[model samples]
Target chain A: LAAPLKVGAIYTIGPYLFPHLIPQLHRVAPQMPLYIEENFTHILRDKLRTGELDAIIIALPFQEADVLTKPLFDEPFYVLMPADHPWTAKASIDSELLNDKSLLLLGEGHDFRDQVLEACPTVRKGDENKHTTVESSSLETIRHMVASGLGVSVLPFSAVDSHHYAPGVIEVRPFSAPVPFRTVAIAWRASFPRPRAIEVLADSIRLCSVAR
Target chain B: AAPLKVGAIYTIGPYLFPHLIPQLHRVAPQMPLYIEENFTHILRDKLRTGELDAIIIALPFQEADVLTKPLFDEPFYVLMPADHPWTAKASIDSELLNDKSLLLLGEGHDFNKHTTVESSSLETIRHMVASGLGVSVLPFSAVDSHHYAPGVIEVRPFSAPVPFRTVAIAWRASFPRPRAIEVLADSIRLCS
Candidate 1:
């Protein structure tokens, strides 16, 4: 029997999507055992390079000499705020609304943090005095901060679906046109010895995304 | 019946609650449980004011009004960047930590005042360490092999005998929910 296919993934995508993604993988390749490790994108990239992981489900725009990537899907970003926040009354938030609002973000090294920065030009890093901006390590913590009426944040659509919270404590709304989004993809070392299972895994993810 | 209110510290809450909550349901299915995560000080206040029945917290905690039952002792580990010079060693000595910049959780957290460099969450501290910000001392479970990303940061135990913090269940003296709190503590011991 062959060894289980070792997979790597980032926290946001792996844990949130696995309940939906894994059953699909099993249906496609029943005999292939699976092992998954979840971490930040940069760490997963290193594990891929060092041969510790067979393939990784991650965000795109990653450039590496020996790494190969296949785009899976694009997930839109949403504005997360306390339910009573003034912006919640609007159908959708204008990127301009963030101009005077405090935008809480994940700490550095998170690809999502970088993506949020790129999508919102008005938001800046390390401007602690702005009181309009802050950062945290996990989306869960950021959500709690928002629930406590600390400030507002932007999150990927998957985060909204995966986590449960008390109604009226938090609310999610789409951003006005030119909405921020992230492209998730599968990445692996170009010279990987076993491509069959990796291919199947990637196909399952693609199929699952389409079904959703 | 009102659900038993339990407060847990953030660092240990994620790792402990998932296992502990289910066991509580199995042992005392008739009793509903309410768990809240917060820092030690806030939980202590809640416990004192009758807002909370009990709290799970790290010890060496001193409060005359509260009674505590020891649950478990979680060993401390040195968390450093993967490529750090200390990574070459199998384990580290506590004396060596004096010279290193020890990153810690900010105000409201248990160890906030212990170190000058502080972050708001344990996940952020790990990211900061991976970025080569500074080293940190964390509970064994928080930095356990399975929980951390391999090759990003290395965790080593202390060679010298450094006191590991004891996790205990604290409640105000002569509290109302003795049986429920005892059931909660027993469940915690079973899991830990």
Candidate 2:
């Protein structure tokens, strides 16, 4: 039997994707257990060098020495607000609207938060305690705050799972057009011995995830 | 929820309160809880100074003249890589933890023995353990596989001498709103 495969994932992707991947992966490669970690991309990038991780699920623009990245999907960003908020009347949300409405972020230094800020031309990043900005610990926690009518948040389309919340708890809207998005991909050491395992992992993610 | 200031330990608030908010709103619409997540000691300080009206925290949280309503038993589990030799067994005994490299939250404190590495947060510790750096001990809500997608990390129970943390809602003994405290405690009891 082979030793388990270790895979690292960023905070934005893993918690959302893994539940779906597990059932399918179990059916296909029951013998190959996966040791998964969700961390900052840069940290996972470093661990990839130390041989602590076999592969990682991350957003693109991830490049490194002796590491290879494969683009997996185009993940569109969306807006989530409380169901009772005035924004719920709109068919789709515009990035410009976020500047005026309070924006909940995934704290400082998260790659996902960086991506969210770039997509919004006027949403400033540094003013955490200010009226327009609030920092949250995790995506799930942020969703509840939004549901509680605290503020709105920008999340990747894949992470906005509406199934978990109650009826009329929160509303999800797509970015009108020229939809803001990031490319999610798999990265691994070029020297990794479990090349086959990485292959199975990449396949499992694409098969089970909501990525387009 | 009549406009009360509440606080919870960082480790407990993120996992427990998110779910509790909806239920609280449904049941106690008039009662509003403005909450913050901070370290236990910091929360203890806030609760002492009356900056915070109440705190939802774990056991061994002792202080002078505070009233505690014991809530639930949140068990601690050994979080390790799915394929580590320890996973071969159903549950872990504390003695087995003596020589192991253990990962913990650097900011907070925990189950003693060999401390291998300290990460920024409980979730950070989770990732490090998944990378095979070391195993970690986290409360049931944090590492509860039943609720969260385990994601390449396996959760194991402790042996007969099961280790657990007692969750409680703490408030100043002199706090005048017993009815409000009853409402808060009952709401949480139903949620948990």
Candidate 3:
């Protein structure tokens, strides 16, 4: 009999996707022993190398050569603001309006913050007002903070469905010109043995994600 | 319906809170739960500091200083190529990985801190793994979705009953939200 396959994973900030993916994994690789990690894109790669994890499902733009990667999905970006803010009523805003607006960001360790900045080069770096910066290690925290009227932030349209968002407290709008999107993918060590179970699981994820 | 104040920060993807809202409304028809998303890590600080009532977080990152209750456990798994030698082992130990350099997740994912990797640099970690430096463990959700190339390295469990992080509801000890906390805790225990 074949031995059980072991796989490691690292996920980005959002938790909503898990409900969809978890069920698929069970159907595809129910016997495969799996380990999961939830985190941002940068850390996913780091964990993959340490022998701590085998593969990861995370946001992409990996520049490394040793790791083999496959793109999974392209997620659109949106703007989040306090419900009572002036921009709340707009269908969307031009990226240029951010030239002087105060934008909030995750602390130093997050790659999404950097990705957004890269996608919108015109955005100026601004400090968190009231000598306070809303820094959350996770996406959930960021969603809550934006709803509290701390400041405005750019978010993925995928994150707009959070339940914690108060009615009229936050708004999600599309980006102007070159509306940016983040491509998510799975990455693994180029040399790691690709087991049948792991392949089955990966294929299942690809299919389910596309369906979503 | 009484209005409830809540908050959050803007993030990369969708979250569970929204999915649960409809169910919540069904349970408490007259409750108007208000949510406020923000960039305020400070508000979480405030949530624990008495400015707000409570917040949600996965278990591991929650500070030891705060009062917390586990909402659900998020298990992390391992990945390897199907033909790897380690597949024979029923369950592996972290010590087995001491000599084998495995592929690691990079920094900023927060999962990096969860692993036992020694270095902090993303380049160094990737360089080492690319050169066949070591092995790594990651969350099940991540590995399940991504596509990996063949022959890089094999994924294997670091251990059995794989390590997991619990998502918890946290609040300040001095100022507790008795009614809300009670409902939240009961909901977590019942739903999850």
- Fnat for the candidates in order: 0.00, 0.07, 0.04
* Candidate order by decreasing TM-score: 2, 1, 3
* Fold similarity of candidate 3's chain A to the true chain A, as a TM-score: 0.75
lDDT, residue A40, model 2: 73
Candidate 1 Cα misplacement greater than 4 A, ranges: A99-101, A109-136, A210-212, B1-192
Please write out the lDDT profile of model 1 over residues A1-212, one tens digit for every residue: 44666677776676467645654564456566555566677888888888888888888677787888888888888888877789878888776556444776654423343454363356454432222333333566556556546678777888874444545657888888878778888888887888887788877877886652
The C-alpha interface RMSD of every prediction is: 12.3, 5.5, 11.5
**Cα lDDT of model 3 by residue, B1-192, tens digit:** 344444433220123445444344446434444444333365477666554566655544465456877767756555444445676776677545534345453321233123444332232232223233344555443343333234443445556656765656666665435676567556544544
Alpha-carbon deviation at A156 in model 2, angstroms: 2.1
Ten contiguous residues with the weakest lDDT in model 3 chain B:
B121-130
Rank order by DockQ, top first? 2, 3, 1
Q: Highest lDDT among the candidates is held by which one? A: 2
What is the per-residue lDDT of model 3 for residues A1-212, given as tens digits with 9 covering 90 to 100? 22333233333333445445644554455455344445655666677778566776666666665787777677777777766688866776775565343666555333333454464346555633322244445555555555655557766655677554345556677776577677766677787776455567667766775653
Scored by DockQ, the top model is 2
lDDT of 2: 0.72
lDDT by residue (tens digit), candidate 2, A49-80: 89888888888777799888888888888888
Q: What is the lDDT of candidate 1?
A: 0.69
Residue A154 in candidate 2, Cα distance off native in Å: 1.7
Which stretches in model 2 have alpha-carbon errors above 4 Å?
A108-131, A162-164, A210-212, B1-15, B28-55, B63-67, B74-165, B171-182
**Interface RMSD, prediction 1:** 12.3
Q: Tens-digit lDDT track for model 1 on B138-158?
A: 786678523333676788888
